[PDB]
Design a binder for this molecule. Sequence first.
Ligand SMILES: C[C@@](O)(CCOP(=O)(O)O)CC(=O)O
Ligand SMILES: C[C@@](O)(CCOP(=O)(O)O)CC(=O)O
Lengths: 320, 321
Amino acid sequence: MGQATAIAHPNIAFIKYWGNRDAVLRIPENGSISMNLAELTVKTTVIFEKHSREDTLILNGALADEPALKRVSHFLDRVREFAGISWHAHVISENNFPTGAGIASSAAAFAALALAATSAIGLHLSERDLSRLARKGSGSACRSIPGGFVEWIPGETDEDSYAVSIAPPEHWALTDCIAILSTQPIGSTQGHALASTSPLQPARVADTPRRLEIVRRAILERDFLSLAEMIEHDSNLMHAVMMTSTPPLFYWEPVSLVIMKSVREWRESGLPCAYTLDAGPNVHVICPSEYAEEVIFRLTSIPGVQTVLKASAGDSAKLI
Amino acid sequence: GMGQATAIAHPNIAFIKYWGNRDAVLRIPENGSISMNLAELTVKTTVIFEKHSREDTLILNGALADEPALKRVSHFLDRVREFAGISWHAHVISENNFPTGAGIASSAAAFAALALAATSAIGLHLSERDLSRLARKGSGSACRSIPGGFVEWIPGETDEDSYAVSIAPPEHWALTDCIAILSTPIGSTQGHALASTSPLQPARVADTPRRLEIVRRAILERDFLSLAEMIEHDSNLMHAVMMTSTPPLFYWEPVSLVIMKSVREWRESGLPCAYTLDAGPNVHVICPSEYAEEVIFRLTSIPGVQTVLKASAGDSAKLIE
Ligand SMILES: C[C@@](O)(CCOP(=O)(O)O)CC(=O)O
Ligand SMILES: C[C@@](O)(CCOP(=O)(O)O)CC(=O)O
């Protein structure tokens, strides 16, 4: 009755999404900018079938838990509403993420699902509409629909909240050296909802355009130092909000702190690199790709760093 | 020998933090703060005004102070000289019992003791308010070591308006500060000035009355859980601002974070305690005193904790001998 397969990459936010204006629609409180990660992929096949009563979900070869299925089912309901078709679908998804490494899959997964599910049900959405749809699966998924360096235009409405590519992957050879911590959280959905308990979240949110403008310009101009200092600042602002929520969300591990301090010292001593952390203790170390081997060496030397994943700028979600 | 006096004062641990100045020179803070004096740590300072001294001299634990420390003390004594209308320079002899290398800041205790010894030596009989106001200009938090016990710094907007008062005497509430000294340090002065670079500082500052009102009530009501949750929140707010300054100030060490998480776990599992951190990695673990031995036992076992200092609520700065 209709089938398609799409791949999408996770992304690393240079300017973080944290907090929703609308939790249901995943309209964020602030805009965000990320880079897709080429070497990590979710591949998702959607198969719409005649009179399948309910949707099904398999994840990396295994029956998905009911939470995951429900979430994917509600998402497909949106694809059904948008398409006025009623078919239920079998969803098969796999990713190549290193096991236990704590790399969040939701952005890649809902980007791939948005593209596979709409293509399977016969639609031909623009990138913008795919981003808007993916967004409602998981906010950051909207940024994995476009390619390369991506900005989520936060908006106030479902139509207005979507992501676009600032620059293609080939515009700037940046590498994300992801320090995976051996010892290793509260999910994004709960965390976003808790942001409003932090006294500092409104101020963080209100300041986001300043930060976005710097990062956007830095990407366009390939100004690594400006990017570096702002991504650390923006990471720290998000974590500041997290840590001052009620209950506090302390995603950092002790080694996360060692890495953050080490990266700053490395940069200040001549090695261009910068850190950023999502809702977890892994440290993404962004650097011009020519420095990645040196960064990885230094990260690998830090006690407590299990392994370092090397990712370059990835393309948009694609059908295969 | 134109007048001499000796005073003692204790350092203090802020439950609601001072961070950022409205007026850096006068150490008028952006926000109010609340602290508890630490009985078991003391600075004892003798001030002897000398007709023959051309400049002040500062002796610390029997040794000549570094030049920066002398300059701070001499600038402070200039304020006393001005206030008193007297010219004399002084010998300042100070001792303290702080554990060596522990990173326990002495400046609040030092300037509280100096404010009291110096004014007493020079013939003045200042009210606590005026002593606090004076101590504040040596080091802001010293204004909180002038009064006793649990102390609130009224932030104010003027030199006359910024001073601390006792919320409650030490005996009002048996709380212990179990200070986890880490085995493995940008100064406050630079740090406060950088607070203005954090996008989050205005919001932290504007929220302080909410936090002060909770802690003040918690102290008056002996409500440990309310105190506990607010001191951790307040500590994290300050460190949030520090970590989001430009350049960032990351005072936490990895072990700091271990302790912070451990403390929250301990409290949630039924051991009443709460963490707070100043501008450094040591973790002050506040708890009702009946739990201190267990808190200390748990803290002592944490790798990277060099030692744990046990402090109870201390009295006001006092003249002695
Ligand atoms: C914490 C962070 O990863 C957002 C997570 O958002 P989501 O709800 O998992 O899409 C930050 C970011 O990616 O912008
Ligand atoms: C960081 C903190 O210790 C303030 C230090 O201030 P100062 O050293 O008196 O300038 C917090 C506080 O004690 O309120």
